[PDB]
Design a protein around this motif. Structure first.
Motif, PDB file in Angstrom:
ATOM      1  N   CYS A   1      17.529 -48.522  18.083  1.00 36.02           N
ATOM      2  CA  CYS A   1      17.537 -47.276  17.172  1.00 36.02           C
ATOM      3  C   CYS A   1      19.208 -47.188  16.817  1.00 36.02           C
TER       4      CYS A   1
ATOM      5  N   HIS B   1      14.644 -35.791  18.820  1.00 34.07           N
ATOM      6  CA  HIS B   1      14.393 -37.090  18.025  1.00 34.07           C
ATOM      7  C   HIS B   1      13.921 -38.087  19.301  1.00 34.07           C
TER       8      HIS B   1
ATOM      9  N   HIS C   1      10.324 -41.244  20.578  1.00 28.29           N
ATOM     10  CA  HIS C   1      10.272 -42.403  21.137  1.00 28.29           C
ATOM     11  C   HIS C   1       9.154 -42.223  22.362  1.00 28.29           C
TER      12      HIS C   1
ATOM     13  N   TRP D   1      18.287 -45.857  22.435  1.00 31.41           N
ATOM     14  CA  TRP D   1      16.949 -46.437  22.380  1.00 31.41           C
ATOM     15  C   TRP D   1      16.938 -48.043  21.976  1.00 31.41           C
TER      16      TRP D   1
ATOM     17  N   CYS E   1      21.417 -42.085  20.130  1.00 32.75           N
ATOM     18  CA  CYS E   1      20.222 -42.505  20.540  1.00 32.75           C
ATOM     19  C   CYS E   1      20.478 -43.996  20.709  1.00 32.75           C
TER      20      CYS E   1
END
Ligand SMILES: [Zn+2]
Length: 31
Positions: free
Chosen positions: A10, A23, A27, A7, A5
């Motif tokens: 993250c 997952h 977000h 992000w 991930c």
């Protein structure tokens, strides 16, 4: 092929793509 991930700050890793997508929903706000 490992799933990660990418992000904003993250960097959580999964071995399953469905896990990663699942997952990711935390977000985006899909709860
Ligand atoms: Zn994440």
């Amino acid at each position: 092929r490992p799933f990660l991930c990418t992000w904003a700050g993250c960097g959580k890793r999964f071995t399953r793509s469905d896990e990663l997508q699942r997952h990711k929903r935390t977000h985006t706000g899909e709860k």
